[PDB]
Amino acid sequence: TELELLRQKADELNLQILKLINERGNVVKEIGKAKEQGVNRFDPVRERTMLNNIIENNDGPFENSTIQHIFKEIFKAGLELQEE
Ligand SMILES: O=C(CCc1ccc(O)c(O)c1)O[C@@H]1C[C@@](O)(C(=O)O)C[C@@H](O)[C@@H]1O
């Protein structure tokens, strides 16, 4: 059915998104290794810079606040990975 074809396409997109989140995680781990800091590595200026750039590029069907929510979770995960 058409609905099953669309769900398959979304399923494959999920795995494409996962692969990029993982590649991004490896980059953020390397950033941790490079950056020699205080109690924690949180940098709100960096966060805001990334967020602004993502929103600048948001032509898609989601609201900017929704996109921000999702990327904040991605970032939070990156920081936690570094702090491992
Ligand atoms: O932006 C953040 C943290 C964002 C965050 C959002 C919600 C939270 O509840 C939280 O604990 C951290 O950190 C910068 C980006 C980074 O998380 C990334 O590129 O994945 C690396 C981190 O070292 C930066 O400070």
Residue numbers in the entry: 4 to 39, 41 to 88
Provide text from the study.
The first step of the pathway, aldol condensation of phosphoenolpyruvate (PEP) and D-erythrose-4-phosphate (E4P) to 3-deoxy-D-arabino-heptulosonate-7-phosphate (DAHP) is catalyzed by the DAHP synthase enzyme. In B. subtilis, regulation of DAHP synthase is thought to be controlled by its N-terminal domain (BsCM_2), which has residual chorismate mutase activity. Herein, we have reported the crystal structures of the BsCM_2 domain of DAHP synthase from B. subtilis in complex with citrate and chlorogenic acid. A functional trimer has three active sites formed at the interface of two monomers. However, BsCM_2 forms an entirely helical dimeric structure with two active site clefts which are formed by the residue contributions from both monomers, as previously described.
BsCM_2 crystals complexed with citrate (BsCM_2-CIT) and substrate analogue chlorogenic acid (BsCM_2-CGA) diffracted up to 1.9 Å and 1.8 Å resolution, respectively. BsCM_2-CIT and BsCM_2-CGA structures contain four and two monomers per asymmetric unit, respectively. In BsCM_2–CGA, the monomeric structure contains a ‘Chorismate Mutase, type II fold’, a three-helix bundle connected through the loops. Chlorogenic acid, a structural analogue of the enzyme’s substrate, was co-crystallized with the BsCM_2 protein. Unambiguous electron density of this ligand was observed at both the active sites of the dimer. At active site S1, the chlorogenic acid makes hydrogen bonds with the side chain of Arg27, Lys38, Gln86, and the main chain atoms of Arg45, Asp47, and Phe79 of chain B. The ligand molecule also interacts with Lys38, Arg50, and Lys80 of chain B, and Arg10 of chain A through water bridge formation. In BsCM_2-CGA, chlorogenic acid interacts with active site loop L1 residues Arg45 and Asp47 directly and via water bridges mediated by hydrogen bonds. This extensive hydrogen-bonding network might be stabilizing loop L1. Overall, the structure of BsCM_2-CGA resembles the closed conformation observed in prephenate bound GspDAH7PS structure.
